[PDB]
């Protein structure tokens, strides 16, 4: 290892390592866009476009579970088979099955295709980090690796920035009765497979891992790749049994305490971070919803005679109303409720309704012509001498006021806020170290979390999200470096893969628990996240030194 | 072998065996008269009968003329040798003509065989000839030889053409009615023949002209021979048994005596005038007489007065009377042989049978009186052949009985002046003056009620054993010949045979010239208003009888005002020929007119002019006559209403045998058989009553119609002739007109009208028989059946009870059908009866229909049709009745109490069309209200309604109830039973099941056999009772009730008939109408409506949906119908003034867009078979195909429109083609090659409740 380290040191840093860094940051971008499309696209896809206001389901999340298997199947296998071949196969299957998911009719097939795409991509991050760790100089190892991390975050940003441009309309998932148009989700799925496609184009030129190749044998090929790297830098400057036993050799053996501590830290961070990142948009939506619900107008004992309604009335409830000889023509019903109201010869024409619901109403001598007030909008209502003529086909919503654009804009800001906080960790990890950074960042993020109870506003919430995300990126970078630097080259891919699988497991746990505790309490998830961060940042000190 | 052998001439010698001087019995002393024997026991005396009757000693006409329609008096007749020889040849030829016929051969053989009985001995054990039943032929040597004979033919008495059969009576014995028999002297003359007029022959020879037919003398001689045959066996009815009539009223014959003997002799139609009870009485009386004479023959053992042995005489009388000895010299009668002999002598030997065998014309009934006296010549063969008679073969007289027509065969009959003046026996009628005398022989024949008697009321006890030319031919084979009583030597009697004729009852002279004062113009007044005197002055037609009777030179006429205006106009010669042709054209037009209204029951052909023709019912308007006819049936034709009353039929007393197994089954079988016999006997009695009292008036009205038509034709001819007579000679020769052709064509027109009049009158007579006479007997018969059924069922109460109970229940549950073919033999009437039976509606029991601004029961079973003041009738079609939920919006039907029997409603059917509006208020749920009720004392049947349900309920006294329901839902997109006409029919059979069919398809059925006593009711209540909804109402029409269960075929036929396929119908089932806006619905795609697109050439019309929804929660949910562009139908070529459209009408179609009308047109030159329809502004180009022919029949398939080109080429059926995405409307010829071509018109209705936004 000494001679290989010396020749790698003599090779230095130049054109080749930068080109490889770009073609690997492409794969990290793919991982980021996968996390986005699983945590903020599918959960908003299962929404009901018809309901101008809807909740949030997590059916698609299961793909996260698939990522788990990938991170252990395509993550541990590479250490026994190869790093370029495994990454090539993984990203190839991800791209191919994403493209197949683009041309899919029905939600079930699309979700299955997304699940297998997650299977393919979940084994990309360990392989890319292990790949790039066997190419850069030993002294200048913390910096460049740290730089790679930013690509990951950039991925989410890009995946967010384009999303609100293409699909700012929820409910596109649970709807197959629509025409061949409305395929904005189709083109979005097509274009989200761009970074992986460019990475697949690029990886044909990059060579295999020299250290791994030397480990297997054929030292002449290792010498050839070392000579090629040196020449490029000069010109610029002028078996599953074996893999399971290998995984066990990473846990219940000489590497026992280190892997346990690393798993604990990875679970804690991937719990708190992947919980809060989805909690914040949900909390901002709940704040807006509460502000809406405050301005609810209660109406009691009305007698509306001979009135023609032409405008839009929203957020009202009527009780014991007696609407006699009214007329609703070319108007919008928004979040308005009717109870115990007695209609009389009213006329409904070109009325478009959203979340309105009639209850216990006596409707007499009316005409419902050219409307979308279907049967399901009437609950325990008695018609009298009434009629139901032509009825607008399909429900209609004012999508202008029904765009969750914020949920993507908020995610964009959250992913952007880490860019200043990543550079101050890139050109610092060679000075403070690799264990003080992770603990300090974890504890500082915990302190920032304990300040969130104070804040209650849109500006306050977005500010706290930006602060937490900014101080919770150095932790991730130091974690990547400390988890790639410990294990030897014969176990690095496997251990990184199992840790990434545990990270995805924590992502599932957080993105379920935090997103479920909305509207019930605020101190419970915040206290839980602060406890997780404090525990992680207190345990991460008890790690072997690497410097 | 000829009858009379070796023709006798006249002047052959006095030989003594075949031609000799004879001395017939007489009161005093008579000079011997030359008489010639023509056969065994048959003599002819060619001399006037001035011997037998001492009163008839003169040949001059009496001062007081007889009550006779036609009679000729003469004094020089049969006084010359040539006359006597001609008389002899005529008599012999007529005898041979009768003998040739098989029936005539039997008659002559029976007359020759039947010698009078020898009962002249006071002592009971001897046989002696009657001294008055024999003649004395004096031999040329000088002495006489007394001989026994049977028949004598003598020339007539003073009355030349009065033929009668006289007999010589006895002091104590009635020889002609106690079976002994006596010689018969017939007063017959062949040179003279009565002449009649027949008006019921056109059915075979429409080319025949007037009537005036001459009676064949052979038939008259046969009638006299039949009389002699009856009197020779002593079975003639007593003369005092006479068919009595009524004479008090003004419309009745003053006097017409007709004995039962004449009725028996006439036979055929006439013989039915005597009921079966009197026939039974006569048969029993004559059977007892035959038994008495048989016993008298048995007792006697000695004979005095003749040489011949007694045993030969006993054999002769045995073969005459068909007695049955039993090898011990004990003569006795047997019921079978005497029944056969009596039937032969009474029914086989009749004038009608002789007419049928001879194939000649005769008056079918004695009412068709004789009119003229015709002198005829019989001896020459060129005028009367032996085999055919006047209808000589291979000549113009062979066909259509032209040999008996005096106006064709003029040379054979010479008309004579009869001595009974036309107005000698008359009745003087007038109103409160203008008094007219009407001949007695031109009045109605009204028999009294005494002549009809019944034994129906008397009961009957049942024990173990209680029981056509081919027929004539069978009798002919069975008859016995070759045995004719040989001539017997009789010891000569005294020179003068003392004897007086059979005493006749005195006939009182009926009063003459009775004056009647009335308050109305009778039919005789109208008939005598149309007559005229053929005077010199001009005769003008007029329409006012009050002036026609007053003014001799003006004749009443019942034709239109145009005709009387025309015939009164003075026309030059230049227009005379055209005038005559126009006149004959108007004659044909007026006489051949008929009545369209046919909803009547088998009175389909109603002749209107009959009303003003006779003042029928005392209205002088043809429209009024038709209205009264439809309102009152055939009663108005009858001058007097017959009174028919059937007594309560007797009960059947059943005897029970102790411990017997076969005899009881025999008693049950006998009971059922006697039930059938009782049904047949009551039917026969009713038929006899109807024939005697009803058909005669119809026949008289028919004859009077013929007379009135003849009078009108003669008046027109006289006017034409008088106008012709006025011209100058050059005008007559240049403009030639002849009378014979005009008379012939007018007669042919009269015959053409007479056919229709005959058909109408036959239909009226049969309708009256089956409407107002049969039910009064059917009620009695079925009440008797119900009474007998309980007795039979109690009687069954060994080991065979189930089969017997089933047999009796099934036998007595139904009824024996009435077939007229078993009681009358008139083809013309039987055909109309079969037509009556053919239609099912004619046999209905209740037939409520709206006719002539009156709701009436066309079946004539209902007494009172009471109508409430709040019952609506649809103005367009008044049959549809609308009933509301008010106490006063009801209809009541009260049936006649004497027609309704207790055991009705056991097997019966009901049918009606009902329209039920949609149920709106929630109160209607679970609410049953009766709409038709026939229950009294909580028992009967009722039709009720409920929310989407039609219920039929049958309930008995024991509170048991059986319901059959038809349920239709209201929550459907399109309903065929909501606010649409539905034809509900219900058939109940007490034995098996009660079923309900909707629209001619079986819907439900349930057993009703468990029910007990469903006691019948009398009132029917059309009223909504118990309905809690306040605005509820129904439409009901075409109600009908039937007295028998209806099978599926009859139900489907009723549905087809009552549907009225000739008229297109809208969605609800009403009548489609002109100038009314209907919404369009397509049956192929009922979920989309028709809409327009840019009216003009470049636009079109398509179909877009969905229609929508009209809902009321928990009540109904139906797709809206008042959608789309409304179609209206503007007339184009319909000549009918009403706005009702009919099949194959040609119409224009307008579509309304923005309350503006656009014609529905297209251009047919565009490529492809499809021709897309368009809407164009009414001032469009007429070159575009727009005329639409509407059709509703292919079997009926909804309402279809067929676009036609302006040149008559068929563009094709309207419909829709999916021309690209938009489903346009097209006139396609593919639809002409038989869906999508069937449409429904939905008009705005107040029963649907949808608001047309
Ligand atoms: C439904 O309403 C029923 C009647 O309430 C009527 O009161 C009138 C004043 C007017 O407000 C109408 O519109 C109302 O419908 C009441 O009897 C029922 O209990 C109500 N049912 C329930 C469960 O709310
Ligand atoms: C309000 O009603 C008036 C009266 O019909 C109409 O002119 C106006 O356009 C309506 N308002 C709107 C926004 O359409």
What CATH number labels A2-289+404-539? 1.20.1250.20
Q: What is the CA radius of gyration of chain A?
A: 28
- Ordered by start, the domain boundaries in chain A are 2-289+404-539, 295-388
- Same-domain check for residues B920 and B983: yes
Contact criterion met (CB below 8 Å) for B1069 and B1248:
no
Name the closest-CA residue to atom 4, ligand 1: A340
- For tokens 């006649």, the residue is B896
Residue A35 and residue A57: Cα distance in Å, rounded? 16
Nearest by CB to residue A383, choosing from B1106, B1112, B1250, is B1112
- DSSP reduced 3-state for B643: coil
The residue out of B453, B483, B509 marking a domain boundary is B453
Write a three-state SS string for A288-342: HHHHHHHCCEEEECCEEECCEECCCEEEEEEECCEEECCEEECCEEEEEEEECCE
* CATH number of the domain that residue B892 is part of: 2.60.120.200
B1142 burial level (CB within 10 Å; 0-12, 13-18, 19+): middle
Within chain B, how many helices (H) and strands (E) appear? Answer: 23, 51
CA A177 from centre of chain = 27
Contact criterion met (CB below 8 Å) for A169 and A243:
no
Write a three-state SS string for B397-427: CCCCCCCCECCCCHHHEEEECCCCCCCCCEE
Q: How far is B1065 from chain A (nearest CA, A)?
A: 27
Distance B665 CA to ligand 1 centre (A): 78
* CATH number of the domain that residue B1106 is part of: 2.80.10.50
Q: At what angle do helices B276-299 and B335-343 cross, to 10 degrees?
A: 120
Structural determination approach: cryo-EM
Residue B177 and residue B233: Cα distance in Å, rounded? 8
Contact criterion met (CB below 8 Å) for B692 and B447:
yes
Q: How is A243-255 classified by DSSP, letter by letter?
A: HHHHHHHTTSSSS
Write the CB contacts of B900 (distance below 8 Å, at least 6 apart in sequence). B779, B1016, B1018
Q: What is the resolution of this structure in A?
A: 4.0
Residue B288 and residue B234: Cα distance in Å, rounded? 12
Residue B744 and residue A496: Cα distance in Å, rounded? 133
Cβ–Cβ of A382/B1113 closer than 8 Å?
A: yes
- Strands B881-884 and B871-873 turn out to be antiparallel
- Ligand 2 proximity of A242 Cβ (cutoff 6 Å): no
Q: Is residue B964 part of a domain?
A: yes
- Same-domain check for residues B1041 and B1143: no
The residue out of B813, B835, B857 marking a domain boundary is B835
- Same-domain check for residues B936 and B1039: yes
Residue B162 and residue B72: Cα distance in Å, rounded? 8
Find the helix or strand (DSSP H, E) in which A186 lies.
Answer: helix A184-191
Q: Is residue B510 part of a domain?
A: no
Q: Is residue B989 part of a domain?
A: yes
- Same-domain check for residues B940 and B980: yes
- Spell out a b/e string for B243-257, using b for 16 or more CB atoms within 10 Å of the CB, else e: bebebeebbbbbbbe
Residue B999 and residue A142: Cα distance in Å, rounded? 96
Report A:354-373 residues touching B (Cβ under 8 A): 365, 367, 369
- Same-domain check for residues B1052 and B1083: no
Write the CB contacts of A527 (distance below 8 Å, at least 6 apart in sequence). none
**A383 near B CB under 8 A:** yes
| DSSP code for B1140 | B
Residue B1108 and residue B1088: Cα distance in Å, rounded? 9
End-to-end CA distance of chain A: 17
* CATH number of the domain that residue B644 is part of: 1.20.1120.10
Name the closest-CA residue to atom 24, ligand 1: A360
Q: How far is A367 from chain B (nearest CA, A)?
A: 8
Helices (DSSP H) in B359-500: which residue ranges?
Answer: 469-478
Find the helix or strand (DSSP H, E) in which A406 lies.
Answer: helix A405-416
Q: Is residue B480 part of a domain?
A: no
Per 3-state DSSP, what percentage of chain A is helix, strand, and coil (rounded to 5)? 60, 10, 30
Query: Quick one: which atom of ligand 1 is closest to the CA of A320?
Result: 11
- Same-domain check for residues B557 and B702: yes
Supply the range of the domain harboring residue B1129.
Answer: 1079-1242
Residue B635 and residue B728: Cα distance in Å, rounded? 55
Query: Quick one: which atom of ligand 1 is closest to the CA of A319?
Result: 11
Q: Is residue B433 part of a domain?
A: yes
- Same-domain check for residues B827 and B853: no
What is the total count of domains within chain B?
A: 4
Query: Phi and psi dihedrals of B440, rounded to 5?
Result: -65, -30
Q: Is residue B1186 part of a domain?
A: yes
- Ligand 1 proximity of A117 Cβ (cutoff 6 Å): no
Cβ–Cβ of A386/B1110 closer than 8 Å?
A: yes
Residue B60 and residue B158: Cα distance in Å, rounded? 7
- DSSP reduced 3-state for A416: helix
Which one, of A114, A182, A192, A199, lies nearest residue A155 by Cα?
A192
- Same-domain check for residues B672 and B624: yes
B147 burial level (CB within 10 Å; 0-12, 13-18, 19+): buried
Write the CB contacts of B220 (distance below 8 Å, at least 6 apart in sequence). B163, B188, B193, B194
* CATH number of the domain that residue B165 is part of: 3.90.1240.10
Task: Provide the token pair at B161.
Answer: 């053409």
Task: Provide the token pair at B448.
Answer: 């009294």
Task: List residues bridging with B1146 in a β-sheet.
Answer: B1189
- Best of A323, A343, A360 for a ligand 1 pocket test (most atoms within 8 Å of beta carbon): A360
Write the CB contacts of B519 (distance below 8 Å, at least 6 apart in sequence). B431, B432
Which one, of B912, B886, B913, lies nearest residue B1032 by Cα?
B886
Cβ–Cβ of A389/B1114 closer than 8 Å?
A: no
Query: Quick one: which atom of ligand 2 is closest to the CA of A308?
Result: 2
Contact criterion met (CB below 8 Å) for A250 and A490:
no
Looking at the domain A295-388, which fold is it?
Pectate Lyase C-like (2.160.20)
Distance A332 CA to ligand 2 centre (A): 14
- Same-domain check for residues B196 and B151: yes
Contact criterion met (CB below 8 Å) for B1096 and B1175:
yes
- Same-domain check for residues B1096 and B1192: yes
How far CA A538 is from CA of A252, A432, A524, B391, B1013, in Å, comes to: 24, 17, 21, 150, 105
Contact criterion met (CB below 8 Å) for B100 and B4:
no
The residue out of B402, B436, B453 marking a domain boundary is B453
Enumerate chain B positions whose Cβ falls within 8 A of a Cβ in A: 920, 1106, 1108-1114, 1120, 1123, 1249-1251, 1253
CB pairs under 8 A between A and B: 39
Q: Is residue B1247 part of a domain?
A: no
Distance B1112 CA to ligand 1 centre (A): 17
Residue B528 and residue B428: Cα distance in Å, rounded? 12
- Strands B881-884 and B982-989 turn out to be unpaired
- Ligand 2 proximity of A310 Cβ (cutoff 6 Å): yes
| DSSP code for B947 | T
- Same-domain check for residues B1187 and B1133: yes
B597 burial level (CB within 10 Å; 0-12, 13-18, 19+): middle
Q: Is residue B124 part of a domain?
A: yes
- Same-domain check for residues B831 and B875: no
With CA atoms as reference, the chain B residue closest to A378 would be B1113
Query: Phi and psi dihedrals of A476, rounded to 5?
Result: -60, -45
Residue B1147 and residue B400: Cα distance in Å, rounded? 53
Residue A28 and residue A405: Cα distance in Å, rounded? 25
């Amino acid at each position: 290892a000494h001679q290989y380290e010396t020749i790698m040191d003599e090779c230095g840093h130049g054109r080749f390592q930068w080109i490889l860094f770009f073609v690997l940051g492409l794969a990290l971008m793919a991982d980021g866009v996968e996390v986005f499309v699983v945590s903020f696209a599918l959960p908003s896809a299962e929404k009901d476009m018809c309901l101008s206001s809807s909740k949030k389901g997590m059916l698609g999340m299961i793909v996260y579970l698939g990522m788990m298997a990938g991170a252990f199947i395509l993550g541990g296998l590479a250490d026994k088979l190869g790093r370029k071949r495994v990454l090539s196969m993984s990203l190839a299957v991800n791209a191919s099955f994403a493209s197949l998911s683009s041309f899919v009719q029905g939600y079930g097939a699309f979700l299955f295709c997304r699940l297998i795409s997650g299977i393919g991509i979940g084994g990309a991050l360990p392989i890319v980090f292990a790949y790039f760790s066997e190419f850069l100089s030993r002294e200048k190892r913390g910096e460049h690796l740290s730089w790679l991390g930013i690509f990951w975050m950039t991925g989410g940003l890009y995946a967010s920035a384009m999303a609100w441009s293409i699909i700012p309309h929820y409910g596109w998932g649970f709807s197959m009765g629509t025409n061949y148009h409305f395929h904005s989700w189709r083109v979005f799925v097509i274009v989200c497979a761009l970074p992986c496609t460019v990475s697949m184009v690029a990886l044909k030129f990059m060579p295999e891992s020299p250290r791994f190749l030397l480990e297997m044998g054929k030292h002449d090929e290792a010498w050839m790749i070392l000579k090629q790297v040196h020449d490029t830098n000069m010109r610029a400057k002028g078996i599953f049994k074996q893999v399971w036993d290998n995984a066990l050799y990473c846990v219940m053996g000489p590497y026992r305490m280190n892997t346990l501590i690393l798993a604990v830290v990875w679970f804690a961070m991937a719990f708190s971070y992947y919980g809060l990142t989805v909690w914040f948009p949900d909390m901002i939506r709940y704040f807006q919803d509460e502000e809406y619900k405050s301005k609810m107008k209660v109406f009691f004992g009305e007698h509306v005679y001979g009135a023609t309604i032409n405008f839009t009335m929203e957020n009202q409830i009527h009780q014991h109303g007696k609407l006699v000889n009214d007329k609703f023509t070319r108007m919008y019903f928004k979040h308005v409720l009717f109870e115990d109201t007695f209609f009389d010869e009213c006329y409904f024409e070109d009325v478009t309704s959203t979340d309105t619901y009639f209850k216990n109403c006596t409707i007499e001598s009316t005409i419902f012509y050219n409307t979308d007030l279907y049967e399901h909008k009437f609950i325990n209502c008695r018609f009298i001498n009434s009629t139901f003529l032509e009825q607008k086909e399909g429900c209609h919503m004012d999508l202008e006021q029904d765009n969750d654009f914020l949920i993507y804009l908020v995610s964009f800001l959250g992913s952007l806020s880490v860019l200043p906080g990543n550079i101050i960790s890139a050109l610092l990890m060679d000075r403070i170290g690799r264990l003080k950074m992770i603990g300090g960042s974890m504890l500082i993020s915990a302190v920032c979390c304990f300040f969130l109870f104070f804040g209650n506003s849109e500006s306050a919430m977005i500010g706290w999200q930006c602060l937490f995300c900014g101080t919770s990126i150095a932790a991730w970078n130091a974690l990547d470096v400390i988890t790639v630097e410990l294990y030897p080259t014969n176990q690095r891919a496997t251990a990184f893969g199992i840790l990434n699988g545990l990270c995805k497991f924590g992502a599932i746990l957080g993105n379920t628990i935090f997103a479920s505790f909305v509207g019930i309490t605020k101190v419970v998830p915040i206290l839980l996240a602060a406890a997780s961060l404090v525990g992680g940042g207190l345990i991460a000190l008890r790690l072997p030194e690497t410097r | 072998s000829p009858f009379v052998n070796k023709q006798f001439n006249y002047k052959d010698p006095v030989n003594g065996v075949d031609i000799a001087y004879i001395k017939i019995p007489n009161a005093g002393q008579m000079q011997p008269v030359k008489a010639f024997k023509i056969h065994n026991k048959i003599w002819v005396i060619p001399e006037r009968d001035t011997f037998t009757n001492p009163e008839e000693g003169d040949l001059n006409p009496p001062p007081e003329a007889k009550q006779v329609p036609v009679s000729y008096y003469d004094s020089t007749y049969l006084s010359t040798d040539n006359e006597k020889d001609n008389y002899l040849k005529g008599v012999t030829k007529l005898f041979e003509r009768i003998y040739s016929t098989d029936l005539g051969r039997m008659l002559l053989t029976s007359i020759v065989r039947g010698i009078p009985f020898w009962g002249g001995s006071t002592i009971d054990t001897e046989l002696k000839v009657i001294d008055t039943n024999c003649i004395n032929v004096i031999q040329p040597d000088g002495s006489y030889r007394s001989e026994e004979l049977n028949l004598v033919i003598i020339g007539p008495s003073a009355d030349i053409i009065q033929f009668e059969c006289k007999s010589f009576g006895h002091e104590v014995l009635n020889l002609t009615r106690n079976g002994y028999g006596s010689t018969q002297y017939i007063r017959f003359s062949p040179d003279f023949t009565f002449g009649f007029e027949e008006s019921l022959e056109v059915d075979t020879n429409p080319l025949l002209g007037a009537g005036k037919f001459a009676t064949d003398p052979a038939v008259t001689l046969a009638h006299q021979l039949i009389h002699a045959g009856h009197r020779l066996y002593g079975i003639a009815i007593n003369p005092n048994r006479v068919f009595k009539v009524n004479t008090n009223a003004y419309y009745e014959m003053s006097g017409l005596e007709v004995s039962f003997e004449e009725l028996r002799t006439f036979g055929g139609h006439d013989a039915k005038f005597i009921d079966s009870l009197q026939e039974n009485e006569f048969r029993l009386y004559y059977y007892n007489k035959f038994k008495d004479i048989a016993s008298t023959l048995n007792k006697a053992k000695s004979i005095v007065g003749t040489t011949a042995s007694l045993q030969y005489m006993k054999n002769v009388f045995k073969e005459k009377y068909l007695l049955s000895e039993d090898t011990s010299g004990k003569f006795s009668v047997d019921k079978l042989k005497f029944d056969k002999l009596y039937k032969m002598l009474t029914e086989i030997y009749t004038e009608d049978n002789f007419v049928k065998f001879f194939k000649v014309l005769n008056a079918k009934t004695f009412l068709n009186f004789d009119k003229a006296v015709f002198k005829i010549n019989i001896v020459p063969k060129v005028n009367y052949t032996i085999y055919d008679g006047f209808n000589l073969r291979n000549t113009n007289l062979a066909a259509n009985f032209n040999g008996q027509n005096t106006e064709i065969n003029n040379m054979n009959f010479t008309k004579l002046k009869n001595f009974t003046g036309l107005f000698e026996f008359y009745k003087l009628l007038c109103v409160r003056d203008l008094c007219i005398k009407v001949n007695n022989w031109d009045l109605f024949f009204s028999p009294s009620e005494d002549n009809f008697t019944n034994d129906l009321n008397k009961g009957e006890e049942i024990t173990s054993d209680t029981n056509s030319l081919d027929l004539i031919q069978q009798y002919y084979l069975t008859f016995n010949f070759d045995n004719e009583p040989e001539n017997i030597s009789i010891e000569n009697l005294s020179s003068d045979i003392i004897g007086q004729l059979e005493l006749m009852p005195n006939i009182e002279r009926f009063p003459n010239g009775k004056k009647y004062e009335l308050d109305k113009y009778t039919m005789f007044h109208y008939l005598r208003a149309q007559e005229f005197e053929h005077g010199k002055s001009r005769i003008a037609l007029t329409n006012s009888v009050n002036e026609a009777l007053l003014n001799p030179s003006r004749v009443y006429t019942f034709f239109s005002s145009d005709y009387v205006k025309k015939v009164n106009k003075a026309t030059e010669a230049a227009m005379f020929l055209g005038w005559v042709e126009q006149l004959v054209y108007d004659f044909t037009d007026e006489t051949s007119e008929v009545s369209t209204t046919d909803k009547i029951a088998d009175i389909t052909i109603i002749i209107p002019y009959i009303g003003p023709a006779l003042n029928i019912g005392n209205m002088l308007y043809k429209d009024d006559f038709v209205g009264a006819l439809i309102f009152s049936g055939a009663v108005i034709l009858l001058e007097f209403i017959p009174e028919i009353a059937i007594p309560v039929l007797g009960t059947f007393a059943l005897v029970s045998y102790i411990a017997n197994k076969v005899l009881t089954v025999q008693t049950i079988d006998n009971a059922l058989s006697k039930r059938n016999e009782k049904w047949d006997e009551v039917y026969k009695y009713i038929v006899t009553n109807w024939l005697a009292k009803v058909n005669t008036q119809i026949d008289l009205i028919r004859k009077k119609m013929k007379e009135a038509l003849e009078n009108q034709a003669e008046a027109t001819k006289a006017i034409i002739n008088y106008q012709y007579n006025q011209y100058t000679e050059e005008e007559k020769n240049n403009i030639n007109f002849n009378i014979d052709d005009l008379s012939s064509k007018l007669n042919e027109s009269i015959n053409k009208a007479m056919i229709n009049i005959n058909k109408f009158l036959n239909q009226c007579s049969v309708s009256y028989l089956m409407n107002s006479m049969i039910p009064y007997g059917v009620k009695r018969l079925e009440d008797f059946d119900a009474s007998l059924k309980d007795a039979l069922l109690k009687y069954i109460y060994i080991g065979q009870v189930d089969r017997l109970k089933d047999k009796v229940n099934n036998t007595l549950s139904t009824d024996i059908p009435f077939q007229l073919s078993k009681y009358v033999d008139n083809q013309r009437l039987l055909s109309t009866f079969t037509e009556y039976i053919k239609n099912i509606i004619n046999t209905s029991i209740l037939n409520l229909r709206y006719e002539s601004n009156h709701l009436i029961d066309l079946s004539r079973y209902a007494s009172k049709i009471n109508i409430g003041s709040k019952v609506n009738f649809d103005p367009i079609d008044k049959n549809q009745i609308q009933l509301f939920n008010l106490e006063s919006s009801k209809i009541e039907v009260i049936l006649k109490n004497a027609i309704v029997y207790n055991s009705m409603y056991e097997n019966f059917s009901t049918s009606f069309w009902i329209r039920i509006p949609k149920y709106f208020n929630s109160i209607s749920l679970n609410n049953e209200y009766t709409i038709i009720n026939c229950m009294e004392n909580n028992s009967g049947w009722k039709v009720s309604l409920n929310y989407g349900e039609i219920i039929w309920t049958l309930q008995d006294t024991q509170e048991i109830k059986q319901r059959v329901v038809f349920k239709y839902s209201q929550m459907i997109n399109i309903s065929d039973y909501i606010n649409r006409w539905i034809f509900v029919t219900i058939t109940n059979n007490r034995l098996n099941n009660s079923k309900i069919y909707i629209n001619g398809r079986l819907i439900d059925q349930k057993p009703i056999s468990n029910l007990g006593n469903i006691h019948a009711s009398n009132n029917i209540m059309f009223k909504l009772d118990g309905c809690r909804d306040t605005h509820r109402y129904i439409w009901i029409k075409y109600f009908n009730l039937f007295d028998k269960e209806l099978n599926e075929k009859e139900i489907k036929d009723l549905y087809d008939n009552q549907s009225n396929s000739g008229i297109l119908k809208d969605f609800w089932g009403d009548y489609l109408q002109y100038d009314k806006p209907y919404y369009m619905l397509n049956l192929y795609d009922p979920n989309k409506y028709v809409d327009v697109n840019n009216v003009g050439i470049r636009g079109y019309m398509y179909l877009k949906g969905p229609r929508g929804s009209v809902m009321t929660t928990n009540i109904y949910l139906n797709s809206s119908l008042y959608r789309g562009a409304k179609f209206i139908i503007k007339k184009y070529a319909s000549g009918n003034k009403d706005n009702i459209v009919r099949n194959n009408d040609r119409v224009y179609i307008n579509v309304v867009v923005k309350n503006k009308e656009y014609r529905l047109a297209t251009n047919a030159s565009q490529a492809g078979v499809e021709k897309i329809l368009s809407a164009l502004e009414i001032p469009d180009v007429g070159n575009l195909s727009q005329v639409v022919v509407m059709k509703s029949k292919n079997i009926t398939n909804k309402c279809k429109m067929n676009l036609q080109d302006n040149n008559g080429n068929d563009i094709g059926f309207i419909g829709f083609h999916q021309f690209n995405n938009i489903a346009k409307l097209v006139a396609s010829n593919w639809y002409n090659r038989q869906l999508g071509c069937s449409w429904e018109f939905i008009p705005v209705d107040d029963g649907w409740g949808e608001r047309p936004l």
